[PDB]
Design a binder for this molecule. Structure first.
Ligand SMILES: Cc1cc2nc3c(=O)[nH]c(=O)nc-3n(C[C@H](O)[C@H](O)[C@H](O)COP(=O)(O)OP(=O)(O)OC[C@H]3O[C@@H](n4cnc5c(N)ncnc54)[C@H](O)[C@@H]3O)c2cc1C
Ligand SMILES: Cc1cc2nc3c(=O)[nH]c(=O)nc-3n(C[C@H](O)[C@H](O)[C@H](O)COP(=O)(O)OP(=O)(O)OC[C@H]3O[C@@H](n4cnc5c(N)ncnc54)[C@H](O)[C@@H]3O)c2cc1C
Lengths: 586, 586
């Protein structure tokens, strides 16, 4: 209907077909031999396919299959396409465009690369732009975005190296003869192994874009007008490229507190993952998941770590679970400067560039009680949130609407206030800032634009995992948010402590690993939120997110048989409610 | 209706109540003060509660609440119960019974202890009988059953100790300075740590039965008649105890092949987990999950291991996944004597009892091609299946029907051919032989018998995990079973290889970890079977079993956002079908 109007207008190269028709197969192999990529809509596979056939005549004047369209215009039936192919005209017909590209993606990260690769699959001439603006100290990286270079990938690899520290401790209890005195961790050796894998990913994306015929440009993009993108390369050469559809996926960069010596002497997560020297005695300022994750693995790798907290841990997360995360960290070598804020950072030593050793800094601050903070640290890491930098990316005259935070205000299909311009990932306002979210949004948007899809990205009940020393996985609402939304009387919380079987012989803690189901009483005990603290929390939580998406109830958890022995099986036998007052201990 | 007839007849002590009624609360606190345990049916919480009130008069002649029943007989209303309490008659009224116990459970294992504890909660006078018949060599254990003593618990703990072997190898790549030359495993030190935890579980169950007022009798039970159970204690003293309801939960014991020297010189999984000596050079005869699990961790702990296979691995499991399990094992130190069967076991050395060293045995066998097998092994483990031993437990004159395998033929509510006698766990014919299955069946049966529940145990789509070197988790149908059931044309299989992020820096294999979704085309692409090969497969699979229980489709997997970086997130982005012929490699 109107779907067909939007499909024809937006698709670069699309073929309307039936799977049974011989003429349709004839065109398919001709396009395959000529190496012309395209989208295919099989009308016999659709419920309203007969109605679409009738509506094609509003664009083509014919109601039969096959029907080939290029960039809003009807190209021809079976004989017409074969006419172009025999006369060697077909290549010029399919390349005919108003702009240099069908899609220009500004930002070669999680969402950007996912949108770029998916679009090229349906014959959209795609160009991806990626530029890494160096950190204050001069740290830069390759193609892949935050997650690949300075995010999930190097974070969880260092989290794993920190997990091995306690695997070495457990091994002795499990019978392994080990001299843990004379066992130390080499930071630089780990970094080299981490950066070697990131390098293969940087190279992996370059090859993938080359294989998908996507034009990769290592350049700073700037959308001067709806269709024009200004590019500045490595040589500072300035030029303009044009594109029909524009996808903004520039992401975010870490924030610095406005205090003397922060930019000059302190570092962020951007610098940490490729740091040529061991941080040593480290102060982490912030209470985000980035702050606790970074401070977590540094302490496990034998580092003297202190976390400066202004007010609370993990703002936005479940505060009962956030406390349990912090309690485990505090009991396992992580110090906390509670109710404290920094005032200034002053240098005592410059970073040893040749010996690869950290400098020395003295951090002056103050507690809420009036007491002064004055302690020396070899490395100061700032993790006080991240911000979009779209003032560098958009000229205000284009008309792309931003919120008070500087993030793009988008519709449910990622459309900006400029119709051809779209925004995905971290810069999309009000959306869960995660890697899979950006990739899902990028792929799905690319399918709607060029393949005539209707499927939108579901941003509700997106499961997360904080990779702290003891991992915390969550899917849905926090207990406090569910109570605020529906009232305390409409909320039932089933909970229980558990101990991994691995922890028993290892002589690790009882009643520390914890899980809960936040349920709505009036809605057949609907699971509103799932929360789990324990090892492999990401692997545990994932499967339940599919069930919660389908509208899982407590009864659905009860009728499902557990797998023994696992940590995740405790979700199936939950019985203790919070309202009963019965202790959740094992 | 008829539900009430069955509830009243079977329940030991039950109170029909309303949550609003003050008289009902008066009886509740009187029973709580007198420490009389009971079941409570709140009629205002039920949809048909008004209809039940009317039907109570067929048993009590009254339609009001509260109504107290003891073992099929109406005891009294609010005033009558308080009359018994004031006259000190109530204790004698609630203890009044035809038999010594309301429930006698023969078998103190997974299902048996779960059924015993749950029954006692609703005021059923319960006695659990547990006796461990020593192995041919004289190995015996405490209360808990197979899983606790010689099953899941010691299996996964030794699996973990084998997992630490490769955590030590990976640690070096993650930056840890380790001298792996001069790192060895002590078997006895591991066994002591494993048996110390099993000992706390043995003690844990004894205390739990004592706390729930369950009479534990360390005695061999024999059901001579529907209600009579003959017990033989440690002193060989023979006596008879009577019980209204009988739960058979005697489980199974490992089978021996009928060959010379098998019983005398070979051992089973029953002996392995508390073995005072290191098995050393070991031959594992069998291809079950027990066979591959035991051979898996022995090879990881530095053991020379060979597996004798008659025909195929993991019969009953997905044979594509079973091959991938075996391929990983073969590439990681596990040798396989393919198409081979044993003929005889002959002793070369007797087990060193004082030095705690293994003996020596020579195994004679033959391959299918006519070649002779003749190799020396320090330990021979038989894992050729398990069998019920109910000839020792039931006198044929009772009338309990058994199948050709010797397992109890039961209804969907676990009822035998003798109405008061029930069977749960491994001895229940045609049911998945797992620990959680037995516990679910035991708890649910105990709730139906004494608390008036209607919920039956769902035995369909029970998720499993084979804890081999590389773990394999499965939920639902195997690919070959789904094709046999619905035809090849109605089956679509989505699959992809994956690599754990942990494996990247560790320099472990690409394209070895594997997952697939077996789907039915005609049923909205319904997920019939989930299969995953990789680390933490049990934690991965569990959550999906809830979704599959709810009738998960491929679309439900697609709309669910993944968690990054995890192994389980690959299930959300599956696209490669087996029918397309596209390679599943990354
Ligand atoms: C340390 C840390 C840990 C994290 N851990 C996880 C986790 O475990 N799980 C998870 O799901 N998420 C995690 N994240 C979040 C995740 O990294 C982001 O949500 C994701 O990377 C956002 O993708 P994106 O494409 O929208 O932006 P990005 O991935 O940041 O990609 C945008 C790219 O565009 C480039 N660019 C910017 N401006 C321009 C321009 N002017 N012209 C051309 N190019 C430009 C930038 O160089 C940038 O690399 C983590 C983040 C951090 C900071
Ligand atoms: C090595 C191995 C590994 C396993 N791993 C797993 C796994 O990881 N996950 C999983 O889910 N399942 C696993 N299982 C299966 C699991 O152990 C069983 O399914 C479960 O224990 C069955 O419970 P049950 O109560 O029915 O029988 P049992 O647990 O065997 O309990 C029955 C008990 O009754 C006693 N008994 C027998 N006869 C009498 C009698 N005459 N009088 C009094 N007492 C008697 C026996 O001593 C026995 O201990 C494993 C099994 C083995 C062999």
């Amino acid at each position: 209907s109107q779907w067909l109007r939007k499909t024809v207008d937006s698709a670069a190269v699309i073929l309307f077909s039936k799977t049974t028709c011989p003429y349709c197969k004839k065109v398919k192999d001709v396009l395959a031999e000529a190496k012309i990529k395209h989208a295919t809509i099989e009308l016999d596979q659709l419920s309203n396919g007969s109605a679409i056939q009738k509506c094609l005549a509003s664009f083509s004047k014919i109601e039969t299959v096959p029907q080939m369209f290029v960039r809003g215009k009807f190209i021809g039936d079976s004989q017409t396409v074969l006419k172009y192919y025999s006369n060697d005209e077909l290549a010029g017909i399919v390349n005919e465009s108003k702009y240099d590209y069908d899609l220009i993606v500004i930002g070669g990260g999680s969402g950007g690369l996912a949108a770029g690769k998916e679009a090229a699959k349906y014959g959209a001439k795609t160009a991806v732009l990626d530029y890494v603006e160096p950190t204050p100290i001069g740290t830069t990286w390759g193609l892949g975005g935050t997650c690949v270079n300075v995010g999930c990938i190097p974070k969880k690899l260092m989290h794993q190296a920190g997990l091995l520290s306690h695997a070495l401790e457990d091994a002795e209890h499990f019978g392994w003869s080990l001299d843990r005195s004379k066992i130390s961790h080499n930071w630089s050796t780990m970094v080299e192994g981490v950066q070697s894998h990131i390098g293969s990913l940087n190279w992996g994306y370059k090859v993938a874009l080359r294989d998908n015929q996507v034009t990769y440009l290592n350049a700073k993009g700037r959308l001067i007008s709806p269709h024009e993108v200004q590019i500045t390369d490595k040589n500072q050469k300035v030029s303009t490229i044009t594109g029909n559809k524009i996808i903004l996926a520039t992401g975010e960069r870490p924030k610095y507190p406005e205090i003397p010596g922060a930019v000059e002497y302190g570092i962020t997560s951007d610098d940490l993952f490729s740091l040529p020297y061991f941080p040593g005695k480290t102060l982490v300022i912030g209470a985000s998941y980035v702050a606790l994750e970074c401070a977590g693995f540094l302490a496990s790798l034998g580092g003297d770590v202190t976390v400066m907290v202004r007010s609370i841990l993990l703002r936005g997360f479940d505060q009962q679970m956030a406390e349990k995360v912090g309690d485990y960290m505090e009991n396992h070598g992580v110090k906390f400067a509670k109710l404290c804020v920094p005032d200034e950072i002053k240098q005592l030593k410059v970073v040893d560039t040749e010996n690869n050793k950290p400098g020395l800094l003295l951090v002056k601050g103050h507690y809420t009680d009036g007491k002064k903070f004055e302690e020396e640290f070899e490395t100061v890491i700032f993790a006080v949130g991240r911000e979009p930098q779209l003032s560098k990316v958009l000229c205000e005259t284009v008309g792309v609407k931003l919120d008070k935070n500087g993030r793009v205000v988008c519709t449910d299909d990622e459309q900006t206030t400029v119709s051809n311009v779209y925004a995905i990932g971290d810069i999309n306002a009000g959306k869960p800032q995660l890697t899979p979210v950006a990739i899902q949004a990028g792929r799905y948007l690319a399918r709607r634009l060029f393949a005539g899809a209707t499927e939108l990205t579901d941003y509700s009940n997106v499961a997360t995992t904080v990779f702290t020393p003891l991992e915390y996985g969550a899917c849905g609402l926090s207990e406090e948010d569910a109570i605020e939304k529906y009232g305390d009387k409409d909320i039932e919380v089933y909970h229980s402590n558990f101990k991994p079987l691995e922890w028993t012989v290892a002589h690790r803690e009882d009643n520390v690993c914890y899980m809960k189901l936040v349920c709505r009483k009036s809605d057949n005990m609907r699971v509103l939120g799932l929360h789990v603290l324990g090892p492999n929390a990401g692997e545990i939580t994932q499967g339940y997110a599919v069930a919660i998406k389908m509208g899982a109830t407590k009864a659905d958890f009860d009728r499902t048989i557990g797998i023994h022995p696992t940590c995740s099986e405790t979700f199936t036998t939950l019985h203790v409610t919070k309202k009963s007052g019965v202790s959740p201990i094992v």
